[PDB]
């Protein structure tokens, strides 16, 4: 009586149940694991807070309306302030982590709409100015708020044009990245497990984000007659196999 459909994920002191899942994706078919010695470089023993950092943090909720263009969060940024995960983050020189991402959106059998939930490794954004204008730090570190693709261009911020993925590629091809759809008629959640993907064994958690999670409405939300025209979307994310190394004074970052 197991269905692909019902699932339970327990991680730390927190549990999620979905009764309307559509399997789960594990990026590149690899599950998060700690850093092996053969791959290690820094000689420091690392710190593995385990259950105090590897639990589920639910970010603040978004509201899908007929005019929504899509939202974008960066990792580990989105979690920069969650509990002890965040403290560890500002206090060590280097850290490394994988995540379980669970995006939630329920409706009824009269609604229609379909969101794309995708994880993009190394999502370098484009400046809407063109040329070689850079995208300032603050703009690519929105924190739990994430970036709202239907917000206005700002100065020093990225471009927010959806048919171009914020980088000069077409929305249609985002499907080459680990992703899952939430089609109100099928699905009510999306779950993706992200292994740590980098060109170095461990890195800085503040100067470099290693994935952007993106939720994009593709088939517009259509509510039943005289229904309220909107649904909330909630994102809950859990660091998994986290390791921190090179402890010290506590980083100070712009803004």
């Amino acid at each position: 009586g197991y269905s692909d459909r019902v699932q339970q994920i327990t991680l730390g002191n927190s549990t999620i149940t979905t009764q309307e899942a559509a399997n789960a994706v594990v990026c590149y078919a690899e599950w998060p694991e700690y850093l092996p010695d053969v791959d290690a470089s820094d000689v420091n023993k690392t710190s593995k807070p385990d259950t105090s950092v590897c639990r589920f943090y639910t970010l603040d909720s978004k509201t899908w309306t007929t005019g929504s263009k899509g939202w974008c969060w960066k990792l580990p940024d989105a979690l920069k302030d969650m509990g002890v995960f965040g403290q560890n983050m500002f206090f060590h020189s280097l850290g490394r982590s994988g995540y379980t991402v669970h995006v939630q959106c329920n409706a009824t059998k009269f609604h229609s709409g379909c969101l794309l939930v995708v994880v993009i490794p190394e999502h370098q954004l484009a400046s809407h100015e063109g040329g070689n204008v850079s995208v300032k730090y603050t703009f690519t570190h929105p924190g739990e708020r994430g970036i709202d693709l239907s917000s206005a261009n700002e100065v020093g911020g990225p471009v927010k044009d959806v048919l171009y993925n914020m980088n000069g590629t077409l929305l249609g091809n985002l499907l080459i990245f680990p992703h899952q759809f939430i089609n109100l008629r099928t699905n009510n959640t999306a779950t993706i497990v992200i292994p740590y993907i980098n060109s170095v064994p461990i890195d800085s958690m503040t100067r470099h984000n290693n994935v952007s999670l993106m939720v994009i409405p593709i088939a517009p939300l259509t509510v039943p007659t005289g229904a309220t025209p909107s649904l909330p979307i909630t994102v809950t994310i859990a660091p998994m196999c986290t390791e921190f190394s090179g402890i010290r004074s506590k980083s100070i970052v712009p803004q």
């Binding site: 197991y2 269905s3 692909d4 459909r5 559509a22 399997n23 789960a24 994706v25 594990v26 990026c27 590149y28 078919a29 690899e30 080459i176 680990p178 099928t186 779950t191 497990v193």
Partner: protein, 40 residues
Amino acid sequence: INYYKDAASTSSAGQSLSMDPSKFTEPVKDLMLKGAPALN
């Protein structure tokens, strides 16, 4: 025959002949069998 000492100096590599699209085409956690229902 390599005439040179360093590995960078050798010619192109030879075909992976690796080929396994499943990391890209089927990264699902619970295995899906073709023919069985997608969602049970």
